[PDB]
Design an enzyme around this catalytic site. Structure first.
Site, PDB file in Angstrom:
ATOM      1  N   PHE A   1     -11.247   2.409   3.697  1.00 19.88           N
ATOM      2  CA  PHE A   1     -10.163   3.001   4.834  1.00 19.88           C
ATOM      3  C   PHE A   1     -10.942   4.022   5.699  1.00 19.88           C
ATOM      4  O   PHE A   1     -11.416   4.743   5.393  1.00 19.88           O
ATOM      5  CB  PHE A   1      -9.102   3.800   4.410  1.00 19.88           C
ATOM      6  CG  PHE A   1      -8.012   2.974   3.576  1.00 19.88           C
ATOM      7  CD1 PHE A   1      -7.194   2.190   3.850  1.00 19.88           C
ATOM      8  CD2 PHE A   1      -8.198   3.155   2.210  1.00 19.88           C
ATOM      9  CE1 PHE A   1      -6.248   1.444   3.170  1.00 19.88           C
ATOM     10  CE2 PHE A   1      -7.183   2.156   1.458  1.00 19.88           C
ATOM     11  CZ  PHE A   1      -6.225   1.417   1.901  1.00 19.88           C
TER      12      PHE A   1
ATOM     13  N   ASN B   1       0.791  -0.975  -0.006  1.00 19.24           N
ATOM     14  CA  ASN B   1      -0.079  -0.105   0.066  1.00 19.24           C
ATOM     15  C   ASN B   1       1.086   1.334   0.023  1.00 19.24           C
ATOM     16  O   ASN B   1       1.390   1.578   1.179  1.00 19.24           O
ATOM     17  CB  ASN B   1      -1.108  -0.064   1.275  1.00 19.24           C
ATOM     18  CG  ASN B   1      -1.881   1.078   1.246  1.00 19.24           C
ATOM     19  OD1 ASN B   1      -1.750   2.040   0.264  1.00 19.24           O
ATOM     20  ND2 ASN B   1      -2.713   1.249   2.248  1.00 19.24           N
ATOM     21  N   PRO B   2       1.266   1.744  -1.098  1.00 18.89           N
ATOM     22  CA  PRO B   2       2.201   3.045  -1.201  1.00 18.89           C
ATOM     23  C   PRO B   2       1.680   4.031  -0.744  1.00 18.89           C
ATOM     24  O   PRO B   2       0.292   4.369  -0.596  1.00 18.89           O
ATOM     25  CB  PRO B   2       2.411   3.210  -2.682  1.00 18.89           C
ATOM     26  CG  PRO B   2       0.988   2.551  -3.291  1.00 18.89           C
ATOM     27  CD  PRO B   2       0.571   1.638  -2.593  1.00 18.89           C
TER      28      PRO B   2
ATOM     29  N   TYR C   1      -0.059   7.856  -0.490  1.00 25.33           N
ATOM     30  CA  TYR C   1      -0.758   8.733  -1.457  1.00 25.33           C
ATOM     31  C   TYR C   1      -0.558  10.038  -1.162  1.00 25.33           C
ATOM     32  O   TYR C   1      -0.580  10.466  -0.237  1.00 25.33           O
ATOM     33  CB  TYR C   1      -2.562   8.446  -1.330  1.00 25.33           C
ATOM     34  CG  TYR C   1      -2.736   7.125  -1.381  1.00 25.33           C
ATOM     35  CD1 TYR C   1      -1.923   5.945  -1.773  1.00 25.33           C
ATOM     36  CD2 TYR C   1      -4.162   6.889  -0.778  1.00 25.33           C
ATOM     37  CE1 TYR C   1      -2.469   4.418  -1.758  1.00 25.33           C
ATOM     38  CE2 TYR C   1      -4.539   5.438  -0.669  1.00 25.33           C
ATOM     39  CZ  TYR C   1      -3.991   4.383  -1.077  1.00 25.33           C
ATOM     40  OH  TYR C   1      -4.332   2.783  -1.013  1.00 25.33           O
TER      41      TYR C   1
HETATM   42  N1  LIG Z   1       2.543   1.093   3.365  1.00 25.47           N
HETATM   43  C1  LIG Z   1       1.760   1.921   4.556  1.00 25.47           C
HETATM   44  C2  LIG Z   1       1.333   3.408   3.879  1.00 25.47           C
HETATM   45  S1  LIG Z   1       2.667   4.172   2.979  1.00 25.47           S
HETATM   46  C3  LIG Z   1       3.438   4.753   4.524  1.00 25.47           C
HETATM   47  C4  LIG Z   1       4.557   4.333   5.097  1.00 25.47           C
HETATM   48  O1  LIG Z   1       5.728   4.455   3.890  1.00 25.47           O
HETATM   49  C5  LIG Z   1       6.794   5.229   4.130  1.00 25.47           C
HETATM   50  N2  LIG Z   1       7.249   5.884   2.981  1.00 25.47           N
HETATM   51  C6  LIG Z   1       6.745   7.108   2.750  1.00 25.47           C
HETATM   52  N3  LIG Z   1       7.313   7.584   1.450  1.00 25.47           N
HETATM   53  C7  LIG Z   1       8.483   6.835   1.263  1.00 25.47           C
HETATM   54  C8  LIG Z   1       9.397   6.591  -0.040  1.00 25.47           C
HETATM   55  N4  LIG Z   1       9.491   7.575  -0.594  1.00 25.47           N
HETATM   56  N5  LIG Z   1      10.037   5.548   0.056  1.00 25.47           N
HETATM   57  C9  LIG Z   1       9.938   4.370   1.302  1.00 25.47           C
HETATM   58  N6  LIG Z   1       8.959   4.550   1.992  1.00 25.47           N
HETATM   59  C10 LIG Z   1       8.293   5.603   2.137  1.00 25.47           C
HETATM   60  C11 LIG Z   1       6.437   6.298   5.465  1.00 25.47           C
HETATM   61  O2  LIG Z   1       7.612   6.320   6.121  1.00 25.47           O
HETATM   62  C12 LIG Z   1       5.307   5.298   6.126  1.00 25.47           C
HETATM   63  O3  LIG Z   1       5.996   3.990   6.936  1.00 25.47           O
END
Ligand SMILES: NCCSC[C@H]1O[C@@H](n2cnc3c(N)ncnc32)[C@H](O)[C@@H]1O
Length: 390
Positions: free
Chosen positions: A176, A85-86, A88
Site C-alpha cells: 500500500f 479489505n477491512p 485496520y
Molecule cells: N474497504 C476499504 C478500507 S476499510 C474503510 C471503509 O470501511 C468503512 N467502515 C469502517 N468501519 C466499519 C464498520 N465497522 N462497519 C462497516 N463499515 C465500516 C468506512 O466507512 C470506509 O468506507
DNA sequence: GTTCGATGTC
DNA sequence: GACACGAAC
C-alpha cells in the site's frame, strides 16, 4: 485507503462462489471487490455490501447496500463468499489510538467476539465476524496486516481459524503506497483443516502465488517462513527462553510517577535509557532520549532486576537481534531484560556476540520477514543458543 | 506486568 | 527506509 488493482485482481483470482451464491463485501464504500468479482465471473450471484458511513456507500443497482456497523450486523442468511479489505486499527483513546467508538460499542464488540484479546484490532474482529457469517464450505478472501501471523493479541484468532476451517496465507508485504503496513491475503474456507503458507511474486495478472510450506495439522501456532536452515538451527540448539526469564522494562508512566525521576539532568542523576541507547554489543550511557533522569541506585525500585548487570535485547529495531550487556545497571524505559534461570551459568560476552551475529540476523529475517516492526517476546524466546547440560 | 502500531520522523 | 510510548488489558 484504496486497495491497489493488483491486490484486488489477485484476491478475486482466489475467490469462489456457486452460481446464485451470496457474495459479500464488508466495509465496502463503492464496492471495488463486488465490481471486480462481477467483472471476472458475471452477473449470476447475489451481491451485498455493508458500509457504516452513508456518505461512502456507493454501489450499483445490482448490489444490495446495507448501512450498518458490519461487526454488529445480523443478516438473515449466511454467505458463500466474503471478500474485501477491512479497516485496520486499534480501538482506543484518540490521543494514542486511531479507532474511536463509544464505550458501549467496544463492550458490544468484546461480547460478540470470542477472539478479542488485549487491545486487539478491527481487522481481527472483521475476520472473526466474516467467518461466523460463512455458510459451511463458504470462502473468505481478505487483505489484512501480517501481524496476526505472530502476535499474541491474535492467538485466539489463529486458534479459531485453525478449528473453523482451512487457511491459506499469501504474503504480499508492503503493498500500500505510503503505508508501512506489511500485508497478507488470507483465503479461508469453512471446511477441512490445515494451513498453507504462500509467498508471492508480482506478475502481469497481479501476483503469482508460490507455495512455501504446508501445515496440515495447524492448531493456531505462530506462522513463520521456515527454511531448511532455520529448522536445522533450531534443532541444533535450544530455546533462549529455557535459559532466561524474559522481562520487559518498566513503562514511561511508571518513571513519570516515581519521586526521584526528573526532567532535567543534575548531580547524581543518570539518563533513563531507551532503545536508542542500545547498540549491538554496547550501550550509550551519555545521550538522553527519554527526557527523564534519576539516581541510578534507585532504579531497582521500579524493577528489582535493574540493580545488577544483565543482558538487554532490543524490541524496536525491526526484525533484528540487537543485544548488549549493561555492565552499569542503568534504569531502562524500554527493551527486554533477560535474567538467567536457576542454575544457568552464562558467559555474557560470548552470548552477546552470538545474538548479534550475521547468522542470527539472517535467521530472524527469514522466519519473520517484516510482519511487525519488532523483535517480539515470542520470537526472542525461540532464538537458538547452545544446548546447556541439564 | 507487558503489549501494539493503514504508528512517525526526516 | 533506518530506526524508532503510553492506553489498554
Ligand atoms: N474497504 C476499504 C478500507 S476499510 C474503510 C471503509 O470501511 C468503512 N467502515 C469502517 N468501519 C466499519 C464498520 N465497522 N462497519 C462497516 N463499515 C465500516 C468506512 O466507512 C470506509 O468506507
Amino acid at each position: 485507503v484504496e486497495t491497489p488493482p493488483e491486490v484486488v485482481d489477485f484476491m478475486v483470482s482466489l475467490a469462489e462462489a456457486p452460481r446464485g451464491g451470496r457474495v459479500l463485501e464488508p466495509a465496502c464504500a463503492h464496492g471495488p471487490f463486488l465490481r471486480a468479482f462481477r467483472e471476472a465471473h458475471g452477473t449470476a450471484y447475489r451481491f451485498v455490501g455493508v458500509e457504516i458511513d452513508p456518505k461512502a456507500l456507493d454501489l450499483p443497482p445490482w448490489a444490495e447496500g446495507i448501512l450498518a456497523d458490519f461487526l454488529l450486523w445480523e443478516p438473515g442468511e449466511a454467505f458463500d463468499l466474503i471478500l474485501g479489505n477491512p479497516p485496520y486499527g486499534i480501538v482506543g483513546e484518540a490521543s494514542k489510538y486511531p479507532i474511536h467508538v463509544f464505550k458501549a460499542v467496544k463492550d458490544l464488540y468484546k461480547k460478540a467476539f470470542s477472539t478479542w484479546k488485549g487491545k486487539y484490532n478491527l481487522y481481527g474482529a472483521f475476520l472473526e465476524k466474516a467467518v461466523r457469517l460463512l455458510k459451511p464450505g463458504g470462502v473468505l478472501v481478505f487483505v489484512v496486516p501480517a501481524t496476526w501471523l505472530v502476535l499474541e493479541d491474535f492467538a485466539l484468532l489463529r486458534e479459531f481459524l485453525a478449528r473453523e476451517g482451512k487457511t491459506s496465507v499469501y504474503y504480499l508485504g508492503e503493498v500500500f503506497p505510503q503505508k508501512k503496513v506489511s500485508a497478507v491475503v488470507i483465503r479461508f474456507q469453512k471446511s477441512g483443516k490445515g494451513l498453507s503458507l504462500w509467498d508471492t511474486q508480482e506478475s502481469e495478472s497481479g501476483f503469482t502465488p508460490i507455495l512455501w510450506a504446508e501445515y496440515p495439522h495447524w492448531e493456531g501456532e505462530i506462522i513463520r517462513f521456515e527454511t531448511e536452515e532455520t529448522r536445522k538451527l533450531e534443532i541444533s540448539g535450544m530455546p533462549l527462553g529455557d535459559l532466561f526469564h524474559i522481562r520487559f522494562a518498566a513503562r514511561s508512566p511508571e518513571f513519570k510517577k516515581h519521586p526521584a525521576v526528573r526532567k532535567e539532568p543534575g548531580p547524581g542523576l543518570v539518563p533513563v535509557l531507551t532503545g536508542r541507547n542500545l547498540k549491538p554489543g554496547w550501550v550509550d550511557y551519555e545521550k538522553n532520549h527519554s527526557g527523564l533522569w534519576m539516581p541510578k541506585e534507585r532504579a531497582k525500585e521500579l524493577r528489582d532486576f535493574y540493580a545488577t548487570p544483565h543482558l538487554v535485547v532490543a524490541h524496536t529495531k525491526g526484525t533484528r537481534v540487537v543485544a548488549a550487556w549493561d555492565e552499569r545497571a542503568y534504569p531502562w524505559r524500554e527493551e527486554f531484560h533477560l535474567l538467567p534461570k536457576e542454575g544457568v551459568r552464562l558467559d555474557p560476552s560470548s552470548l552477546v556476540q552470538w545474538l548479534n551475529s550475521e547468522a542470527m540476523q539472517k535467521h530472524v529475517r527469514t522466519l519473520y520477514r517484516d510482519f511487525v516492526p519488532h523483535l517480539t517476546l515470542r520470537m526472542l524466546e525461540r532464538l537458538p543458543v547452545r544446548r546447556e547440560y541439564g
